[PDB]
A paper describes a structure:
To identify differences between LTA synthase and primase enzymes, the soluble extracellular enzymatic domains eLtaPLm and eLtaSLm were overexpressed and purified from E. coli and their crystal structures were determined at 1.75- and 3.0-Å resolution, respectively. The overall structures of eLtaSLm and eLtaPLm are very similar (root mean square deviation = 1.4 Å for Cα atoms). In this study, we found that Thr-307 in eLtaSLm is phosphorylated, whereas the corresponding residue Thr-279 in eLtaPLm is unmodified. The purified protein was digested with chymotrypsin, and peptide fragments were analyzed by electron spray mass spectrometry. This analysis showed that for eLtaSLm expressed in E. coli the catalytic Thr is mostly phosphorylated (73%), whereas only 2% of the protein purified from the natural host is phosphorylated. As the crystallization buffer for both Listeria proteins contained a high MgCl2 concentration, it is likely that Mg2+ is present in the active center in our structures. In eLtaSLm, this surface groove is constricted by Lys-306, which form a hydrogen bond with Tyr-483. No electron density is observed for the side chain of Lys-306 in both the Listeria and Staphylococcus eLtaS enzymes, suggesting that the lysine is flexible and therefore could be used for stabilizing the phosphate group of an incoming terminal GroP.
Lipoteichoic acid (LTA) is an important cell wall component required for proper cell growth in many Gram-positive bacteria.
Author numbering: 230 to 644
């Protein structure tokens, strides 16, 4: 109740002077890389790079790239990722939080940044009823929701899950250019979605040769996404948004489940056991902050840490908000990444499937020490306190002093 707030502050990580406020006043552009796993980065299928542009964006001067960034989603899949990004809250242990907690009071990024005059918007090539986004986005405080109704949904431009990504970015330039700055936006892509079907040739790369169809055509839809993103970034550079915004590319969750051990063994080269599968849960995080020296960031982290990381870059102190994540650029950030099912990843030891593993060598640890038991309970506590917020709707009874709550009745996403 006030218990959650006490845990939050004690966990709070002070801003890093080198990165604090360096992007204050800038726009924010989230690029949602659907089902995009980190191992795809710099991966070469039969000689050539699978995702060439993203690989270059990864190496760029002004790009903070994360190699130990893990997704913390559950049965909510993509919805849970949004929950982690917007509120720094975990999803439910079971089922989707978006569907059952659409009535809850939230104090999300749209609301927090809205306090400074930011304009909110979400772009998605599918209808707003999907994942109950239409309802819960109002509680988040998203000013605009550009769903499928704002796009040309002809049969040739539409896959199984909605509008293809290349038309999606192309057609959304109209809306983004006329959106009041400064803004806070997120572009949810669709094409790279299981079982990853692509008809030739939207595709521009040969499929893998493992014998597993869903795994083989994954690399094809990944490049289709890569090509469309490049086209979108090219637009951002022409319109000047590229220098005036913070571009953040991230993955929401895994792309290949653990029911493809044989194929994944050929892909990664090593045996795809339970350990290597947990390591495969890495998803990309690339933060392009204009006029800031970037580089590879190997500190361990999760999606829960994304919002407080962004806030510190924008020069916004979030000490008083109910957020379970910490600033990734902070030196006080502790490298501990909880999974939804109770598991966790630390640089030294990791619990996977309830069993202990050496994170660095992959070899099982027979006996469990105190510190391995201690962090196990720290993780369970964090997950429980997060559920306490969702299950009890605790944000009705709390808010930071200067903060103003959202009136969801004042939002309409229809045209
Ligand atoms: Mg997804």
């Amino acid at each position: 109740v006030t218990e959650v707030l006490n845990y939050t502050k004690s966990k709070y990580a002070a801003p890093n002077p080198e990165y604090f406020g360096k992007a204050k006043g800038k726009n924010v552009i989230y690029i949602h890389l659907e089902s995009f796993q980190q191992f795809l980065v710099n991966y070469k299928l039969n000689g050539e790079e699978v995702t060439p542009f993203i690989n270059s964006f990864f190496k760029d001067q002004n790009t903070l790239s994360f190699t130990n960034f893990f997704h913390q989603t559950g049965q909510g899949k993509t919805a849970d990722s949004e929950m982690l990004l917007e509120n720094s809250l975990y999803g439910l242990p079971q089922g989707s939080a978006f569907t059952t907690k659409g009535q809850n009071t939230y104090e999300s990024a749209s609301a927090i940044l809205g306090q400074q005059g930011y304009t909110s918007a979400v772009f998605h090539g599918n209808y707003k009823s999907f994942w109950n986004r239409d309802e819960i986005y109002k509680q988040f405080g998203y000013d605009n929701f550009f769903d499928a109704s704002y796009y040309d949904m002809n049969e040739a431009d539409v896959s199984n899950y909605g509008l293809k990504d290349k038309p999606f970015f192309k057609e959304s330039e109209e809306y983004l250019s006329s959106l009041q700055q400064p803004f806070y936006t997120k572009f949810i892509t669709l094409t790279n979605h299981f079982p990853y079907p692509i008809d030739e040739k939207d595709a521009s790369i040969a499929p893998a040769t493992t014998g597993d169809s869903s795994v083989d055509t994954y690399f094809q839809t990944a490049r289709y996404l890569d090509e469309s993103v490049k086209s979108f970034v090219d637009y951002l550079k022409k319109s000047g948004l590229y220098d005036n915004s913070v571009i953040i590319m991230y993955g929401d969750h895994y792309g290949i489940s653990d029911n493809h051990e044989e194929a994944m063994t050929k892909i990664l080269g090593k045996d795809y056991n339970t350990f290597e599968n947990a390591q495969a849960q890495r998803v990309p995080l690339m933060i392009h902050v204009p006029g800031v020296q970037g580089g590879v960031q190997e500190q361990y982290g999760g999606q829960v840490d994304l919002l407080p990381t962004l806030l510190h870059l924008l020069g916004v102190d979030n000490k008083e908000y109910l957020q379970f994540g910490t600033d990734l650029l902070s030196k006080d950030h502790k490298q501990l990444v909880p999974f939804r099912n109770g598991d966790y990843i630390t640089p030294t030891y990791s619990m996977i499937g309830g069993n202990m593993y050496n994170q660095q060598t992959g070899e099982p640890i027979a006996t469990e020490t105190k510190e391995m038991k201690e962090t196990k309970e720290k993780v369970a506590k964090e997950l429980e306190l997060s559920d306490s917020v969702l299950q009890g709707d605790l944000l009705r009874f709390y808010a930071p002093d200067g903060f103003k709550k959202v009136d969801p009745s004042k939002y309409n996403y229809n045209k």
